[PDB]
Amino acid sequence: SNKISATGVLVELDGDEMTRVIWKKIKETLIFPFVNVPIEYYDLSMENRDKTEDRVTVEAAYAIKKHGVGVKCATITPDEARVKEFNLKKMWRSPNGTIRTILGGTVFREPIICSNVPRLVTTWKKPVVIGRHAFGDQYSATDAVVKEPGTFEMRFIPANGGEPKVYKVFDYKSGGVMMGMYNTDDSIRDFARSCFEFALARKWPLYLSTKNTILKHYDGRFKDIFAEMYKALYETKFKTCGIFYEHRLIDDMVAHCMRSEGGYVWACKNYDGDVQSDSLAQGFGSLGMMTSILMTPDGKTVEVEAAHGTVTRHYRDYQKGKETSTNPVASIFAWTRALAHRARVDNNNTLLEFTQRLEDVIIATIEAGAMTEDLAICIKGEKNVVRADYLNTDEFIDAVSQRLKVAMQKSKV
Amino acid sequence: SNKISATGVLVELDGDEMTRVIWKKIKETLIFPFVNVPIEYYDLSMENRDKTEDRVTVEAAYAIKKHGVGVKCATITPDEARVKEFNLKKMWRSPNGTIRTILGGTVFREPIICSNVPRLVTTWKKPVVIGRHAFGDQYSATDAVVKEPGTFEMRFIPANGGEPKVYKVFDYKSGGVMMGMYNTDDSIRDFARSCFEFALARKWPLYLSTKNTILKHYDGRFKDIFAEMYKALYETKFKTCGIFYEHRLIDDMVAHCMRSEGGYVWACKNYDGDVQSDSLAQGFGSLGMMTSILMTPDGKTVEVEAAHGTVTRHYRDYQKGKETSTNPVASIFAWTRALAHRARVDNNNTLLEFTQRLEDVIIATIEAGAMTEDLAICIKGEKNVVRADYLNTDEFIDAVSQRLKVAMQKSKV
Numbered sequence: 001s002n003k004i005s006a007t008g009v010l011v012e013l014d015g016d017e018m019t020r021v022i023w024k025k026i027k028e029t030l031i032f033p034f035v036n037v038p039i040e041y042y043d044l045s046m047e048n049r050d051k052t053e054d055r056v057t058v059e060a061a062y063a064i065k066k067h068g069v070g071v072k073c074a075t076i077t078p079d080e081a082r083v084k085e086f087n088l089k090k091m092w093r094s095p096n097g098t099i100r101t102i103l104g105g106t107v108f109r110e111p112i113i114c115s116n117v118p119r120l121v122t123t124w125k126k127p128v129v130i131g132r133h134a135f136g137d138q139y140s141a142t143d144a145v146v147k148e149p150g151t152f153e154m155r156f157i158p159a160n161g162g163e164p165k166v167y168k169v170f171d172y173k174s175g176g177v178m179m180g181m182y183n184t185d186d187s188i189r190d191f192a193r194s195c196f197e198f199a200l201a202r203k204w205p206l207y208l209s210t211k212n213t214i215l216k217h218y219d220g221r222f223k224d225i226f227a228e229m230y231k232a233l234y235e236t237k238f239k240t241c242g243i244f245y246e247h248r249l250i251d252d253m254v255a256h257c258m259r260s261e262g263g264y265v266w267a268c269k270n271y272d273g274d275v276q277s278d279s280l281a282q283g284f285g286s287l288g289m290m291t292s293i294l295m296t297p298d299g300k301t302v303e304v305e306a307a308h309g310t311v312t313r314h315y316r317d318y319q320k321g322k323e324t325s326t327n328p329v330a331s332i333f334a335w336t337r338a339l340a341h342r343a344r345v346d347n348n349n350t351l352l353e354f355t356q357r358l359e360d361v362i363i364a365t366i367e368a369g370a371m372t373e374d375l376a377i378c379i380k381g382e383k384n385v386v387r388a389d390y391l392n393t394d395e396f397i398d399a400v401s402q403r404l405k406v407a408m409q410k411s412k413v
Numbered sequence: 414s415n416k417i418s419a420t421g422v423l424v425e426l427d428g429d430e431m432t433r434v435i436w437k438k439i440k441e442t443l444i445f446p447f448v449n450v451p452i453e454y455y456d457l458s459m460e461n462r463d464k465t466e467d468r469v470t471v472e473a474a475y476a477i478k479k480h481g482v483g484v485k486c487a488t489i490t491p492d493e494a495r496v497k498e499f500n501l502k503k504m505w506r507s508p509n510g511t512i513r514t515i516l517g518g519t520v521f522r523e524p525i526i527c528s529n530v531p532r533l534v535t536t537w538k539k540p541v542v543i544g545r546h547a548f549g550d551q552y553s554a555t556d557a558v559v560k561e562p563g564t565f566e567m568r569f570i571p572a573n574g575g576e577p578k579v580y581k582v583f584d585y586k587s588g589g590v591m592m593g594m595y596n597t598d599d600s601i602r603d604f605a606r607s608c609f610e611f612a613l614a615r616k617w618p619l620y621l622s623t624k625n626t627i628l629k630h631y632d633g634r635f636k637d638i639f640a641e642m643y644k645a646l647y648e649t650k651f652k653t654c655g656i657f658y659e660h661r662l663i664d665d666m667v668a669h670c671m672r673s674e675g676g677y678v679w680a681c682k683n684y685d686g687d688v689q690s691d692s693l694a695q696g697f698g699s700l701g702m703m704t705s706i707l708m709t710p711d712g713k714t715v716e717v718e719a720a721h722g723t724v725t726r727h728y729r730d731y732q733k734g735k736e737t738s739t740n741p742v743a744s745i746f747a748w749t750r751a752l753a754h755r756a757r758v759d760n761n762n763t764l765l766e767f768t769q770r771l772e773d774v775i776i777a778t779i780e781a782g783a784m785t786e787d788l789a790i791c792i793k794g795e796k797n798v799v800r801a802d803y804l805n806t807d808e809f810i811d812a813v814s815q816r817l818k819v820a821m822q823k824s825k826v
């Protein structure tokens with residue numbers, strides 16, 4: 001007679017702009033009509049993080065750290081332009097900058113994938129997640145220009161005070177630039193732990209990639225850490241759930257992304273992941289089809305969200321009058337996924353089977369020919385798509401809504 | 414009523430193993446039967462590079478210098494387990510090493526591209542090159558592990574005596590790794606010129622790919638140098654030849670690669686192309702299908718060669734009895750496309766008519782049904798393919814040969 005409970009708690013973390021509007025729909029149309037929902041709500045609207053001098057976000061972030069599952073962060077990283085927008089006040093940072101430094105750990109981008117929609121590499125029969133390492137490599141690494149002849153040396157000084165090993169690297173004829181780059185073991189190691197826990201949780205196998213050939217120490221340290229930790233802390237369980245861990249050269253792995261079937265996690269280093277996640281954002285479909293999943297290296301904590309932004313370009317119209325067909329599917333797949341790690345964790349098999357439901361029904365809806373405007377450009381033509389069988393945001397969410405209400409039905413009696 | 418002559422001299426680099434076989438019949442069947450030519454023959458055969466303590470290759474390398482065109486270098490970079498092979502003398506190094514070192518400048522890889530054999534991304538209706546950097550980025554840029562808590566500093570020391578500069582980049586709470594990197598303008602200025610000079614002759618546009626946003630001084634430096642240079646030393650001549658130069662973020666430029674049609678040269682910095690070329694080795698067609706033009710920054714000297722190695726695997730047999738289907742199109746393109754620049758240089762518009770012929774004919778050849786086994790796995794099915802539709806190494810070369818003989822004639826009357 002009732003709905004679907006859960007003993008755990010999902011931290012809701014509200015947004016603003018166009019995402020906020022759609023946030024109430026999927027919330028109201030797809031989630032609460034079927035799910036009982038113990039929620040610790042944190043409003044992150046620009047208005048409201050301002051009121052809270054400094055922030056809600058530190059609260060909300062830690063809230064997530066208590067509960068282990070969080071959902072939304074539709075951001076606003078304000079500008080100087082923005083304060084001018086609605087009388088904001090001094091500074092503010094970026095909400096996610098705070099959360100990702102609080103929770104710590106690593107983000108993983110899962111495409112939404114559907115038979116009818118055109119991948120720019122047709123090969124992909126399943127989605128490929130990518131784990132990118134954000135601690136300083138060349139992201140925290142200085143680099144100075146050189147305007148005269150001279151010598152650039154690296155010097156390692158111990159904190160006891162030994163022979164403070166020196167490095168004659170290069171004496172300049174004339175002109176140029178220089179750089180230094182650093183990455184500690186507990187950084188590399190933490191990043192590994194995450195991958196292992198997230199691949200283990202998504203039931204899929206794991207691939208590393210680097211270029212240790214021409215960086216024998218730096219990138220040798222990655223190969224090492226992962227492979228020992230695999231055979232130390234995961235190996236058997238990874239064996240248990242039928243899922244290897246194999247390292248390949250980046251050379252091999254950008255090709256393997258190209259040529260392989262898909263359905264695995266891929267670990268790339270800090271640089272590589274910026275390069276190749278912006279690659280697969282155009283490739284697998286559109287922004288509005290990926291999510292973003294911050295997992296912790298303990299593997300006990302998740303913040304899921306849509307990969308695409310707090311889409312203002314549409315918010316103009318909203319009810320300034322004109323219709324808009326912003327893609328909710330990444331916003332829904334925010335919740336479905338979140339609910340899943342809530343489900344998985346609480347053992348709870350019932351919500352899980354339901355998140356599985358909604359997801360499959362959103363796939364089935366698009367492949368079934370009713371889709372948003374954004375995908376209607378991909379399926380055929382930029383210059384020749386009219387409002388034939390593609391829907392409004394709302395009409396679209398209804399189309400699944402009704403399609404889920406039959407899936408609810410047909411399964412049980 | 415005669416063959417076709419060239420004015421200026423071409424320089425042959427005859428190599429060893431399986432390639433040096435095909436090189437005869439390619440060079441017999443297709444080349445001199447229609448083509449007068451000045452060559453200056455280097456046998457770079459182990460046996461005949463062994464004799465010389467201090468190699469033939471330094472004279473060949475210096476040959477090509479003077480002549481501005483050069484053709485073969487199908488290598489053998491000898492071995493520990495190779496000196497054993499055939500009573501060698503000690504070490505030798507690799508030619509491809511030596512030569513690039515003298516000649517200088519920048520190697521460029523262009524896919525051989527035909528309709529029936531598939532690109533592993535269907536977009537590519539044309540061939541795309543790559544210019545890698547290669548030297549002193551991370552290539553000469555050493556690194557060590559940091560094995561205990563302590564500080565890693567950088568120091569530029571001049572070579573006049575002014576105040577030195579100094580950076581406390583990072584201190585290690587414990588453990589890890591460190592790495593610095595250095596890259597002079599003259600290098601960049603060489604990488605740019607080569608590119609610019611090389612697009613210029615191909616009639617193809619240019620895109621760079623860097624990450625200056627996230628490496629301000631280091632990667633700003635290139636975004637810069639090509640800009641000035643274009644408008645300083647190229648642009649209007651590009652404008653003239655309907656070509657151009659734009660820059661895109663590395664992020665955008667692996668993504669553009671995927672979605673762009675093809676027919677433009679692209680430069681990625683030393684890392685960014687050591688990654689992305691193995692990618693396209695599987696990605697566009699096969700090894701056996703790329704070639705490899707070193708062009709000097711002066712834009713005045715060229716060494717072309719096949720991608721793939723001096724394919725020892727297939728040679729074992731040769732007459733050890735059994736047939737073979739090593740794919741010669743690269744080795745051939747390595748004549749045609751050398752015969753191309755030679756022409757450009759002599760402004761011999763007539764010969765150029767010829768190099769065109771044999772590239773177009775090999776296109777015809779394959780599309781029409783004739784292929785070697787390597788493509789007989791690529792069109793379809795390693796798990797079922799037989800000798801019906803795939804020519805031998807040498808029946809294939811005759812397949813072209815007949816067809817060029819129709820072309821040569823069935824055009825000119």
Ligand SMILES: NC(=O)c1ccc[n+]([C@@H]2O[C@H](COP(=O)([O-])OP(=O)(O)OC[C@H]3O[C@@H](n4cnc5c(N)ncnc54)[C@H](OP(=O)(O)O)[C@@H]3O)[C@@H](O)[C@H]2O)c1
Nearest residue numbers: 075076077096287288308309310311312313314326327374
């Ligand atoms: N940590 C961060 O910095 C972060 C992360 C996420 C968001 N944000 C915030 O989001 C705000 C706006 O971001 P932005 O406009 O720069 O990036 P964005 O929100 O992703 O929008 C850029 C373009 O993406 C398309 N798009 C976005 N969501 C879509 C959807 N659901 N369906 C279809 N198309 C969609 C829109 O295309 P068309 O309208 O052209 O169809 C839009 O023009 C910013 O104020 C930013 O601070 C910040």
Ligand SMILES: NC(=O)c1ccc[n+]([C@@H]2O[C@H](COP(=O)([O-])OP(=O)(O)OC[C@H]3O[C@@H](n4cnc5c(N)ncnc54)[C@H](OP(=O)(O)O)[C@@H]3O)[C@@H](O)[C@H]2O)c1
Nearest residue numbers: 488489490507509700701721722723724725726739740787
């Ligand atoms: N600068 C350098 O150091 C350099 C560069 C190039 C080559 N080499 C030298 O070349 C020698 C052999 O190297 P390698 O055999 O590892 O590389 P390779 O000559 O490219 O052959 C390796 C594999 O590639 C495939 N292959 C190569 N050419 C082909 C063609 N024309 N058609 C179809 N498939 C082809 C073969 O595949 P299947 O047999 O599996 O079909 C072969 O097993 C070595 O002595 C190496 O040092 C050196």
